[PDB]
Every structure is written in C-alpha cells, then in structure tokens.
Amino acid sequence: DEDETTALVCDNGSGLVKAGFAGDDAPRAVFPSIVGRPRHQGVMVGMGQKDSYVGDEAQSKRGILTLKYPIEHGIITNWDDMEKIWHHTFYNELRVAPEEHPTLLTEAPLNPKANREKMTQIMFETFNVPAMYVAIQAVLSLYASGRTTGIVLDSGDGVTHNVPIYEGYALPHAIMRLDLAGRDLTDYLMKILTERGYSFVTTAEREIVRDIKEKLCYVALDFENEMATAASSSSLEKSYELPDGQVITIGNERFRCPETLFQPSFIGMESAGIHETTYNSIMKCDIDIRKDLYANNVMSGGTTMYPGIADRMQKEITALAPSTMKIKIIAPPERKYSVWIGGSILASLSTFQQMWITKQEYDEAGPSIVHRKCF
Amino acid sequence: RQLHARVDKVDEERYDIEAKVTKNITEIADLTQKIFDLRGKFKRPTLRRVRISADAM
Amino acid sequence: QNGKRQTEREKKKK
C-alpha cells in the first residue's frame, strides 16, 4: 500500500504497542499489549465468541475476560501471544505484510537477552520479514528530541532504564537502572483506592485504575506541602466516572501513588528514586562529560505526563548538582511518544541501512544474530 | 542447466503463489466466517416456516 | 570416572 519498502515500526512495551511505518510522524494504530481470555462458561449458542482476544478486542470485551500482558518489565515472556499481537497489528489495523517490509522493534540496553532474540525470531519466522533491527529506547528518544548527548530517563510502564549517552555513545558504567515503573504505580493506586472503599482487584478493575491514573494523578513539585493541603481539605479532590456509573474521588492518594517514583519505599522498594538515579547517571560519567549531561536531562517514556514531573525532575537534580553550573531538563510534547518517533527516524536514516539484519544472514546464524548485529 | 535452476526456482515460486492464494483463501474463509456471524445475526431469525397451523383447522 | 518452517520447506523443496 506504500510506494516504497518502508520499514514498519512497532514500539512494543509492557503497556501499549504503538505501530505505523517509517517515515511517518505518528503510529497508524495503538494497541494494549494484551491477549484476553474468557473466564466464564458460554450459555447461548451461535454467539460467535473467541477463545482468545487481541489488543483492543481484548480490552473492549474485557467484561468477562481475564487479561494478560505477554510483556512484563520490558521483556516478552509469552511469544505466542506476541505473535497474535503482531498479527493483529500488522494485518488487521496497519493492514501491511512485514514479508515485504523491514521491521524495527525496541528495548532497554540491559533488557535480558531473550527479549531481542525472541523478537527477532518471531519476525523472521512467522512474518518472514526481509530484515530486522532491535533498537535502543534511549537512542530512539534522542533522535526524537534532537540530541546526541544527554541522560535518557525513560520511566515507563516496565522499567526505568536511565542511560547516559555522549556524542551518540553509551556510557554503560553509569546506567542507573531501576526496577521501579509505571506498572507499580498502577498497583499502588489500586491498593490505595481500595482503602477509600473502592476495591480494585480484578482485571476490569485494574484497567479502570490505569485509566484513573492517567487522567487524575500527578507528582507535583513539593510533596509535603501538597499533602499538607490535600490531607486537610476536599478542595484538592478530583472525581472520576467508572463504566457502571460509580463515582470515585481521589484526594492525597492522587499524588501519593505517583510520588513513589521519588519515594520507592511507599511500595516496599529499596531505591533512591528516579531523581537520584538521574543525578548519578550524570555524576558517574567522566568530569568532561558531566557538564553536557547536566545541561541535557532528556525525559521520555511513560509517567512523563504526570503534572509537575518535568519541573520536579529538574529541581531534584539541580538541588544535588554543584552551584555555578546550569542544569536543564528537556521534556517536549513528544515525551513517551519518543521511542516510536525515533524508530521512524532511525529506520529511515541512510546510515542505518548498514545496521539492518537481512533474511539471509538470519538463516545462517539463526535469531542469535541479533546479538552480533544490533547492539 | 540454466533451465534446471529456472525450474527449481520457478517450481518454488509457483508453490509460493500457491501458498499465497492459499492464505488469501484461508482468510476469505475466516473473515467470511466472522461475516457469516455478522450477517447471521441479521438473517437467522427468519430461517423458519411460521404461522402455518395457526388457523387452518 | 566416566517445525512449521521445516514442514513448509519440505513442501516447497520436494
């Protein structure tokens, strides 16, 4: 349907998959990384009804489905379900056949090896894609943001990777990776709202809480002052409408959940928080690198859309940083949608045509080729 | 021998177009199956002979 | 002190 064998770009995370073609500005469609399955016995006959549902089908029919995510903390653990998600992504909504297009997939630099290897195998064996590449999330964010140097703090649904990059090169000894993510904030919000009389323990309830989080929650610039008021007055509560007509209001819980990014102890995690790890990613780099990383804190990934987060991340690191020097945050309206955007940019670069793995080299090496050719 | 290579590869290619139209036919079957569902939703309730013995006696 | 690709390949190649 395209006038060129443009690469397909699929930003497959632990949240939603954003997909479209290289050279465009935006994904053609977005899909929950979900395969749904009925938890009930059918009663009426000739009702259609699938054994399993994919993406938005799984979410739309969720009233009686248990919903599973094949990707956890950035890694595919269930590749049969990813084959279904990709079939849907490519043939039902983008309506393209990867057999005629190179495909670009994304991951964090320390994502366990099985992820990129199984992603490579699925696209070469079930879709028979002519070429593959698995790209770095930080690289993709840097292209989207217009930078070659900076800290990419990618606090999304799966993991926070936090990798410093200078002149387009990794500074791997300074990756302050953290097992704290948007999915934990969602789990925390389900629990804290349960305490308000609105229990959220089932799949339908979990999807509702994620929707509540995305629309009602924030981190603010000053937690203690924000809570001093939110805990004292109803003036800071915000309502939300649930699908069945219930109305829930959230007070200080509205920010106490999200605050776990700065205070991980709220969910039992042992961590300094995302702002200290951002600071250390800069500090652990050489002294002639530090000045450029301080001036370029690059925000990407999920959770970047919480009110007060860009302002707060700059405040928290500038407060740890030395005086005289200027410390700055980069947080464009392209935040979180930067990995997909970077995929489009990267896939299309003329210099990247030497990075793509072809369905030639693949057959001689097998999917393990991804560890020889990508990064 | 050029012909032998040609027939090797073109046998491959006709088998391949075979499988391609086979997938076209399989997806005709499956999409037209969910379409059987769609249109059945609409047309099944009348596949019935009704109002025969209502009065004839 | 002591799969599917194989099958479709077989189809095409034979």
XYZ file of C-alpha atoms in Angstrom:
446
model
C 0.000 0.000 0.000
C 3.156 2.022 0.307
C 5.230 3.222 -2.673
C 8.450 2.018 -1.032
C 9.510 -0.954 1.108
C 9.480 1.289 4.149
C 10.284 -0.304 7.435
C 7.491 -0.971 9.847
C 7.978 0.428 13.321
C 6.469 -1.271 16.376
C 7.158 0.163 19.808
C 6.170 -2.895 21.858
C 6.177 -2.183 25.558
C 4.618 -3.590 28.732
C 1.765 -1.067 28.283
C 0.607 -0.294 24.708
C 2.188 -1.099 21.353
C 2.479 1.846 19.043
C 2.751 0.903 15.397
C 2.991 2.524 11.960
C 5.528 2.883 9.179
C 8.922 4.501 8.988
C 8.975 7.964 7.592
C 5.670 8.934 9.124
C 5.067 11.282 12.065
C 2.820 9.044 14.125
C 1.780 5.385 14.554
C -1.203 4.234 12.481
C -2.698 2.410 15.430
C -2.013 1.744 19.080
C -2.833 -1.489 20.867
C -2.793 -2.659 24.503
C -0.101 -5.389 24.735
C -2.910 -7.764 25.711
C -4.333 -11.158 24.897
C -7.673 -11.745 26.622
C -9.404 -14.983 27.505
C -12.996 -15.714 28.820
C -13.288 -16.741 32.463
C -16.918 -17.871 32.022
C -18.896 -20.776 30.561
C -20.866 -19.955 27.407
C -24.621 -20.354 27.744
C -26.125 -19.211 24.414
C -25.108 -20.984 21.172
C -24.158 -19.338 17.882
C -22.904 -16.184 19.606
C -19.536 -16.134 17.896
C -17.149 -15.526 20.859
C -13.432 -16.133 20.565
C -11.154 -18.447 22.542
C -8.811 -15.511 22.799
C -8.989 -11.776 22.007
C -6.203 -9.454 20.955
C -5.280 -5.846 21.761
C -8.264 -3.570 21.672
C -10.544 -6.555 21.129
C -9.396 -7.888 24.475
C -9.959 -4.583 26.134
C -13.395 -3.936 24.525
C -14.731 -7.387 25.540
C -12.956 -7.308 28.952
C -16.167 -7.511 30.990
C -15.779 -11.334 31.087
C -12.127 -11.784 30.144
C -9.024 -12.168 32.202
C -6.397 -10.015 30.533
C -2.773 -10.965 30.271
C 0.210 -8.933 29.170
C 2.888 -11.048 27.269
C 5.444 -8.373 28.191
C 6.494 -7.775 31.792
C 9.069 -5.196 32.846
C 10.091 -4.755 29.212
C 10.508 -8.483 28.383
C 8.418 -10.881 26.360
C 7.744 -13.993 28.396
C 4.922 -15.124 26.135
C 5.822 -15.073 22.465
C 2.770 -16.958 21.260
C 0.675 -14.055 22.429
C 3.107 -11.615 20.833
C 2.700 -13.442 17.517
C -1.065 -12.745 17.903
C -0.480 -9.087 18.806
C 1.785 -8.585 15.830
C -0.573 -10.424 13.508
C -3.298 -8.041 14.626
C -1.035 -5.006 14.500
C 0.155 -5.698 11.019
C -2.760 -7.330 9.233
C -5.895 -6.035 10.915
C -5.137 -2.353 11.608
C -1.943 -1.268 9.768
C -3.029 -3.788 7.105
C 0.513 -4.468 5.925
C 2.527 -7.566 5.309
C 6.019 -7.471 7.037
C 7.094 -10.021 4.444
C 7.585 -7.004 2.102
C 8.938 -4.535 4.756
C 11.944 -4.393 7.224
C 10.725 -4.249 10.873
C 12.116 -2.206 13.775
C 11.477 -3.243 17.377
C 12.619 -1.544 20.588
C 14.129 -2.411 24.051
C 16.159 -1.097 27.030
C 20.027 -1.735 26.797
C 20.016 -4.174 29.790
C 16.765 -5.872 28.860
C 17.542 -9.639 29.276
C 18.815 -11.177 26.026
C 15.878 -13.463 25.414
C 13.727 -10.423 24.576
C 15.609 -9.254 21.496
C 16.300 -12.837 20.426
C 12.671 -13.943 20.531
C 11.532 -10.697 18.891
C 13.981 -11.391 16.047
C 12.816 -14.979 15.698
C 9.116 -14.136 15.591
C 9.512 -11.557 12.878
C 11.810 -13.722 10.739
C 9.891 -16.974 11.195
C 6.169 -16.160 11.489
C 6.139 -12.964 9.450
C 9.175 -13.804 7.290
C 10.285 -10.161 7.402
C 13.130 -9.390 4.873
C 15.048 -7.581 7.594
C 15.216 -6.785 11.317
C 16.590 -4.415 13.811
C 16.159 -4.113 17.557
C 16.805 -0.565 18.697
C 17.753 1.113 21.950
C 14.974 3.158 23.623
C 17.413 5.905 24.618
C 18.687 6.201 21.043
C 15.228 6.477 19.727
C 14.361 9.122 22.345
C 17.488 11.125 21.480
C 16.645 11.202 17.789
C 13.066 12.285 18.536
C 14.291 15.022 20.915
C 17.018 16.429 18.645
C 20.000 15.400 20.840
C 23.145 13.280 20.701
C 24.130 13.981 24.286
C 22.040 13.678 27.433
C 20.546 11.402 30.070
C 17.628 9.424 28.895
C 15.266 8.927 31.786
C 12.592 6.641 30.406
C 10.309 5.915 33.494
C 7.627 3.945 31.546
C 5.338 1.024 32.390
C 8.042 -1.669 32.502
C 11.388 -0.447 33.857
C 13.287 2.777 34.325
C 16.500 2.354 32.290
C 18.159 5.748 32.817
C 21.187 5.605 30.447
C 23.668 8.483 29.886
C 24.741 8.963 26.244
C 27.514 11.313 24.982
C 28.110 12.095 21.276
C 25.867 9.167 20.413
C 27.858 6.684 22.545
C 26.853 4.645 25.580
C 28.410 5.343 28.910
C 27.277 1.899 30.288
C 29.105 2.045 33.587
C 26.824 4.889 34.541
C 23.479 3.256 33.766
C 21.457 3.705 36.895
C 18.867 1.098 36.033
C 15.947 0.760 38.382
C 13.230 -1.864 38.928
C 10.556 0.809 39.577
C 7.937 1.598 36.949
C 4.508 2.883 35.931
C 3.023 -0.616 36.448
C 3.986 -0.434 40.154
C 2.386 2.967 40.459
C -0.821 1.421 38.998
C -0.654 -1.422 41.530
C -0.145 1.096 44.324
C -3.117 3.148 43.154
C -5.331 0.017 43.124
C -4.357 -0.618 46.765
C -4.645 2.981 47.993
C -8.085 3.352 46.368
C -9.175 0.065 47.971
C -8.515 1.898 51.282
C -11.090 4.543 50.241
C -13.871 1.998 49.821
C -13.372 1.301 46.104
C -11.735 -2.084 45.821
C -9.770 -2.764 42.648
C -8.540 -6.380 42.474
C -9.865 -7.914 39.176
C -8.769 -7.341 35.562
C -11.619 -4.990 34.748
C -10.819 -3.068 37.884
C -7.101 -2.880 37.016
C -7.799 -1.406 33.566
C -10.074 1.177 35.221
C -7.378 2.153 37.706
C -4.845 2.570 34.941
C -7.341 4.907 33.208
C -7.884 6.774 36.512
C -4.160 7.160 36.979
C -3.592 8.559 33.510
C -6.307 11.219 33.888
C -6.299 12.113 37.641
C -2.836 11.537 39.091
C 0.170 13.862 39.435
C 3.522 14.132 41.226
C 3.657 17.879 41.986
C 6.722 19.976 42.722
C 6.573 19.786 46.556
C 5.109 16.611 48.083
C 4.997 17.614 51.695
C 3.227 20.897 51.061
C 0.917 19.281 48.516
C -0.060 16.622 51.094
C -0.360 19.119 53.907
C -3.228 20.640 51.938
C -4.585 17.501 50.195
C -4.765 15.629 53.501
C -6.542 18.587 55.165
C -9.079 19.656 52.525
C -11.518 18.299 49.949
C -10.641 21.235 47.687
C -7.894 19.109 46.106
C -10.058 16.041 45.363
C -10.903 15.095 41.800
C -13.725 12.883 40.600
C -13.735 10.084 38.050
C -16.605 8.269 36.343
C -16.442 4.496 36.270
C -18.108 2.481 33.416
C -21.019 1.377 35.615
C -21.871 4.906 36.764
C -19.906 4.836 40.030
C -18.073 7.970 41.017
C -14.775 7.860 42.828
C -12.940 10.842 44.177
C -9.264 10.841 44.986
C -7.556 13.235 47.469
C -3.938 12.997 48.536
C -3.835 9.491 47.059
C -3.926 11.314 43.722
C -0.253 12.165 44.165
C 0.900 9.788 46.904
C 0.845 6.943 44.394
C 2.934 8.731 41.694
C 5.229 10.048 44.457
C 6.614 6.503 44.739
C 8.852 7.490 41.796
C 10.606 9.852 44.221
C 9.861 7.729 47.314
C 10.015 3.997 46.334
C 9.708 2.921 49.964
C 5.963 3.578 49.613
C 5.630 0.201 47.848
C 8.388 -1.618 49.748
C 11.137 -0.937 47.167
C 14.715 -0.255 48.155
C 15.669 2.678 45.975
C 16.880 6.255 45.978
C 14.149 7.217 43.494
C 14.254 8.308 39.862
C 15.770 11.726 40.511
C 18.735 10.425 42.417
C 19.363 7.780 39.822
C 19.134 10.539 37.137
C 21.688 12.527 39.106
C 24.017 9.561 39.479
C 23.824 8.753 35.754
C 25.340 12.202 35.218
C 27.776 12.022 38.164
C 29.169 8.592 37.274
C 30.258 9.830 33.831
C 33.650 11.492 33.321
C 34.038 15.046 34.539
C 34.274 16.423 30.958
C 31.021 14.596 30.131
C 29.086 15.713 33.210
C 28.713 19.310 32.052
C 26.893 18.260 28.887
C 24.735 15.709 30.572
C 23.716 18.284 33.262
C 22.598 20.646 30.507
C 20.674 17.838 28.764
C 18.423 15.763 31.027
C 16.231 14.012 28.446
C 12.796 12.967 29.577
C 10.974 10.147 27.811
C 8.790 7.159 28.415
C 5.600 6.937 30.418
C 4.812 8.756 33.713
C 6.379 11.830 31.994
C 2.852 13.033 31.552
C 2.236 13.454 35.317
C 1.731 17.156 36.174
C 4.828 18.519 37.926
C 7.169 15.786 36.680
C 9.410 17.754 34.316
C 9.639 20.673 36.704
C 10.302 18.361 39.605
C 12.938 16.274 37.892
C 14.965 19.387 37.061
C 14.531 20.705 40.635
C 15.588 17.442 42.228
C 18.766 17.049 40.191
C 19.772 20.760 40.197
C 19.491 20.538 44.014
C 22.108 17.704 44.046
C 24.246 19.268 41.310
C 27.049 21.794 42.070
C 26.481 25.548 42.079
C 27.516 27.969 39.265
C 26.653 25.367 36.623
C 23.312 25.411 34.848
C 21.305 22.171 34.902
C 18.433 21.806 32.401
C 15.584 19.425 31.512
C 14.350 18.566 28.054
C 10.710 17.465 28.194
C 8.944 18.095 24.818
C 5.276 17.315 23.996
C 6.874 14.315 22.258
C 7.659 12.740 25.640
C 6.832 8.996 25.804
C 5.899 9.032 22.096
C 9.627 9.490 21.500
C 10.585 5.860 21.177
C 8.175 5.266 18.278
C 9.163 8.598 16.685
C 12.811 7.693 16.981
C 12.028 4.339 15.307
C 10.626 6.138 12.281
C 13.685 8.413 12.142
C 16.241 5.660 12.691
C 14.674 3.169 10.298
C 14.793 5.848 7.573
C 18.419 7.019 8.016
C 20.731 6.190 5.103
C 23.477 5.245 7.552
C 21.136 2.794 9.226
C 20.900 0.725 6.124
C 24.139 -0.881 7.259
C 22.543 -1.833 10.621
C 19.544 -3.837 9.363
C 19.841 -7.670 9.604
C 18.674 -9.321 6.413
C 16.729 -12.582 5.879
C 19.927 -14.087 4.530
C 22.329 -13.645 7.418
C 19.442 -14.705 9.622
C 19.274 -18.144 8.115
C 22.952 -18.879 8.505
C 23.115 -17.526 12.089
C 19.566 -18.023 13.443
C 17.892 -15.430 15.807
C 21.061 -15.239 17.911
C 22.243 -12.934 15.098
C 20.567 -10.100 16.915
C 23.445 -10.166 19.433
C 26.032 -9.833 16.664
C 24.307 -7.194 14.546
C 22.114 -4.847 16.639
C 23.973 -3.591 19.762
C 21.187 -26.388 -16.563
C 20.007 -22.771 -16.560
C 16.593 -24.309 -17.174
C 17.123 -26.748 -14.312
C 17.854 -23.840 -11.974
C 14.905 -21.977 -13.503
C 12.541 -24.888 -12.888
C 13.862 -25.336 -9.358
C 13.236 -21.692 -8.508
C 10.029 -21.353 -10.534
C 8.609 -24.529 -9.043
C 9.406 -22.836 -5.753
C 7.678 -19.658 -6.981
C 4.507 -21.340 -8.244
C 4.298 -23.252 -4.971
C 4.761 -19.874 -3.293
C 1.982 -18.158 -5.237
C 0.038 -21.318 -4.409
C 0.573 -20.725 -0.694
C -0.148 -17.003 -1.092
C -3.512 -17.601 -2.743
C -3.968 -20.365 -0.172
C -3.652 -17.755 2.561
C -5.967 -15.474 0.599
C -8.486 -18.348 0.509
C -7.987 -19.215 4.178
C -8.608 -15.588 5.107
C -11.587 -15.419 2.786
C -12.842 -18.439 4.731
C -12.137 -16.960 8.163
C -13.191 -13.357 7.507
C -16.227 -14.603 5.610
C -16.817 -16.856 8.609
C -16.960 -13.951 11.033
C -19.036 -12.327 8.286
C -21.338 -15.350 8.329
C -21.628 -14.494 12.001
C -22.290 -10.805 11.257
C -24.995 -11.423 8.663
C -26.451 -14.374 10.544
C -27.084 -12.028 13.465
C -29.354 -10.345 10.919
C -30.820 -13.186 8.859
C -31.119 -16.292 11.083
C -34.347 -15.252 12.912
C -36.373 -15.726 9.698
C -34.947 -19.095 8.577
C -38.182 -20.672 9.735
C -41.652 -21.548 8.484
C -44.130 -19.779 10.750
C -47.874 -19.249 11.071
C -48.987 -22.420 9.297
C -51.048 -24.396 11.818
C -52.369 -21.177 13.379
C -55.771 -21.220 11.668
C -56.091 -23.990 9.061
C -58.198 -26.060 11.485
C 35.381 -41.690 36.469
C 33.380 -41.705 33.246
C 8.793 -27.124 12.924
C 6.242 -25.329 10.759
C 9.075 -23.774 8.769
C 10.518 -27.274 8.352
C 7.190 -28.543 7.000
C 6.638 -25.720 4.514
C 10.284 -26.015 3.465
C 9.741 -29.722 2.837
C 6.669 -28.867 0.768
C 8.419 -26.308 -1.437
C 11.717 -28.169 -1.767
C 10.251 -31.566 -2.602
